[model samples]
Target: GMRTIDGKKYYFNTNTAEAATGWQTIDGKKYYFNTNTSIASTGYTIINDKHFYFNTDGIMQIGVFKGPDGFEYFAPANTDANNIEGQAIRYQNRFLYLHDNIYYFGNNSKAATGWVTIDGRRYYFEPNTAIGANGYKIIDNKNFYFRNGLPQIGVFKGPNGFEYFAPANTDANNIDGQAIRYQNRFLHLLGNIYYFGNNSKAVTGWQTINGNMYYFMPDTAMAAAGGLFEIDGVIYFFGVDGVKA
Candidate 1:
């Protein structure tokens, strides 16, 4: 039988004058009863094959905690919640960025280098560059531009001494060579020529515009200077450039 002495429960054999020290098992449960205050110290403890941090009141600590492994982790407030040790967790409803990987929240993570995809979004990290800044990132000796931490799109001159078009909101690596309307003219990159036609076809050779037939070279340029050609008894000439003269 144990007797309460100065707020501390002690078991006396009637043959010993000192109180028991260290841990004691009661009803198959172990609890640390300190001899100093006879109260369990609030701190880290283990229970049921799992590690936990107990408060000064001997209550398990939940929320953020510095684990024994020297890394920050989170524990659920629910007493019966599963363990989340050494795992990335959503703290305060935001994903926790741990280690050297990119995270969606604040882009907070260890400094990393090269291309990385986090939560289905792609980003490039440079060891010598800061995050979230707009600039070009070089990977595999190829320049990839980024804006506000996202890959940039639109026209850009490549290292090959040629201008390339990139679709809006798409990776610049996807170069577009199809004909695109610019400045009210249908321009095609295949031959760097202007094409005019309907139904997705380009007019080739001679074509009639406003009832006026004009010779158009295979590449849409006006036919080379030649003798005047009569159409409806009217003389028409074409200059070196693709235009009716």
Candidate 2:
């Protein structure tokens, strides 16, 4: 139990009536009393553990809150004074940063390098510089394309006219990142048709793929999507399916 004597906190020894200071287990929860001054230390005390902050009055804080250092910390009913409680709390045991479009940091508030998962998607950051990945990047020999530090899946056209296909998720085959289709594959997306030929590049003019013949624009890989399209001299007819009539 704690007592206020002449407007000063005085905690009696657990076993004796003598004045006590420094680390006392009150009501089975860990509490502290400052050294030398014989009072509780304010702010946060970083030793081995005890990372949780105390209230302005030097009492243990409860509930999840943005810590005074701008990072997020969790403590509650079962949260130990210096220890984390459950999985999410324990997973980010030390120096947890809430990634709500916020910069994720490492221990001592350092920029994190390597891979870090936020929400459900994973992102990569460069070493030392700690810059997030953008454009084309190759990790483990697997092509991983990121647009503005976000993983891109499905159909994608690189800045330099490279047609790439990324997997749906991390569990799919082909590294679950990015890959270039080197074989003939016809893709219909966004109500538009795109053709990749045997050379694994966008084909122009007339090309017979599978069992169908299709015409692709010379400058761009986009096909004659719907209705009628004109070639150099002759006006050709195409079905709404982008198939030749």
Best by lDDT: 2
Q: lDDT tens digits, residues 1-245, model 1?
A: 44664544554446786556445554543445555655553455543445555444443444334444322233453322444442223333133333333223333322333555556656665434324424444556444556544565433333332222335323433422211223323434333343344432344566656654456444333232345665456677754333466
Per-structure clash totals for the candidates: 3, 1
lDDT of 2: 0.58
Best by TM-score: 2
Q: Give the TM-score comparing model 1 with the true structure, all chains together.
A: 0.26
TM-score of 2: 0.47
Inter-residue clash pairs, candidate 1: 42-55, 42-56, 222-242
Query: Where in model 1 is the C-alpha error above 4 Å?
Result: 1-109, 157-162, 165-245
TM-score of each: 0.26, 0.47
Q: Where's the lowest-lDDT run of ten residues in candidate 2?
A: 86-95
